[PDB]
Chains A and B, each alone.
Chain A
């Protein structure tokens, strides 16, 4: 019958590893680097677009940084198509929670449910896992500013600063070197860009090859604002830190 052509996506290796999860991570390691840095007064999301073409429309483009609700955003690393499936699910899950409890979803609850979906694809169903790693940047009134990452295994962990995709080994060393706990958003913005600038496989880091977003309490009195940076705003912040 059909047994002959089954890859058996949800099985263990003799060493006790999930073949497809390991190969999905190998896939993600070639994706454009995405960095999250959590400061005391906000969070920074920086992501490098995959080898841009000069005729790509840059202003009306979204590849890396997506908005889940008014308080939570994600940086993507891997297959964009796979990420958009999970993002639409995460967006619905957030609204279901708000509809039920008349309160914005706590960051971890959204992350756990999205991570539980990924786990499902590794244990049952006989389908390939989602070739996606997320950096969740969000705020709630319980824990305040939070960074998380999830990977195809459906395992998630919390971070102060983290990188996903390409050159995470080199990127994580540079973040670990220059990061400190009493850091501000403006400092975290500079660290994020400086790290990408050194770990990039490109000749020089430019505005057209970057996606940038901040989650500050920079709005008027005890409320959170999401800023997805425009091309011109990235061009200005890149000059202001003296990279170009």
Chain B
């Protein structure tokens, strides 16, 4: 054997074991979700409070690309930051040449092709992150989830990390119960609940909630962080549902 020792090597199955090993690093990471809504998207993430010494609200994990795209990821934090840094260069060069801000499907492929490129050679390591991202463009709202292999699809709801199966189960219920659609302000409250429900799979350390959102009506099509009254309103909603 030894097929798993080198990246870009096909096993007799036709599998790249190094990419499957990168997925194990993602599964080990904290829970992050994405909820597609009526006229935008909502991103939420679990931040494990390792110690009292961590400054609250001052270890931001969700990252903005351009002014209209939000990105959250689970697994190796640095890898995620590297991918967003690339995303920003791709989005900048698109706007530079074509004037218009990069569409989400266009942006999704730019990351997809970049992550896929890191499965072609043994001289590079696959990305140790599953990235949930999206925003609002001319064609409306888009939510995507990108995996170490370079595989991405459009999603109604997306979840990754240690509590992905708990989150996925809760996301599936929203899609079933809201066929006509979910509102931006509702999706923020739901996002909070699902993180709190997904925290049951990581319940040794207590955690800190972080939510962001793009909405054509609520945020004027731009990416903003949910803070202050709207954040505490979402936390209180989540606290009431677990009890």
Contacts and interface: CB of A to CB of B under 8 A. Distances in A.
Interface string A1-26: 11010000000000000000000000
Contacts of B122: 1-2
Say what secondary structure dominates the interface of chain B: loop
A2 B123 CA distance: 7
Nearest to A4: B6
Contacts of B5: 4
Contacts of A1: 122-123
B16 to A, nearest CB: 16
A4 B5 CA distance: 10
A155 to B, nearest CB: 37
User: Which of B5, B122, B123 has the most chain A CB within a 10 Å cutoff?
Assistant: B122
Contacts of A4: 5-6
Interface string B122-145: 110000000000000000000000
A41 B5 CA distance: 66
A216 to B, nearest CB: 59
Interface string B30-65: 000000000000000000000000000000000000
Interface in B102-133: 122-123
Contacts of B123: 1-2
B119 to A, nearest CB: 15
A130 B44 CA distance: 63
Nearest to B123: A1
B124 to A, nearest CB: 9
Contacts of A2: 122-123
B43 to A, nearest CB: 36
Interface in A1-57: 1-2, 4
A195 B122 CA distance: 55
A6 to B, nearest CB: 13
A95 to B, nearest CB: 42
B2 to A, nearest CB: 9
Interface string B1-32: 00001100000000000000000000000000
A4 B123 CA distance: 11
Nearest to A1: B123
Nearest to B7: A1
Contacts of B6: 4
A4 B6 CA distance: 9
A4 B9 CA distance: 13
Nearest to B6: A4
A1 B5 CA distance: 10
A2 B124 CA distance: 11
A1 B125 CA distance: 10
A2 B6 CA distance: 9
A3 to B, nearest CB: 10
A227 B122 CA distance: 55
Interface of B: 5-6, 122-123
For the complex of A and B, list the 6 residue pairs with the smallest distance between their C-beta atoms, beginning with the closest: A1-B123, A1-B122, A2-B122, A4-B6, A2-B123, A4-B5
6 contacts: A1-B122, A1-B123, A2-B122, A2-B123, A4-B5, A4-B6
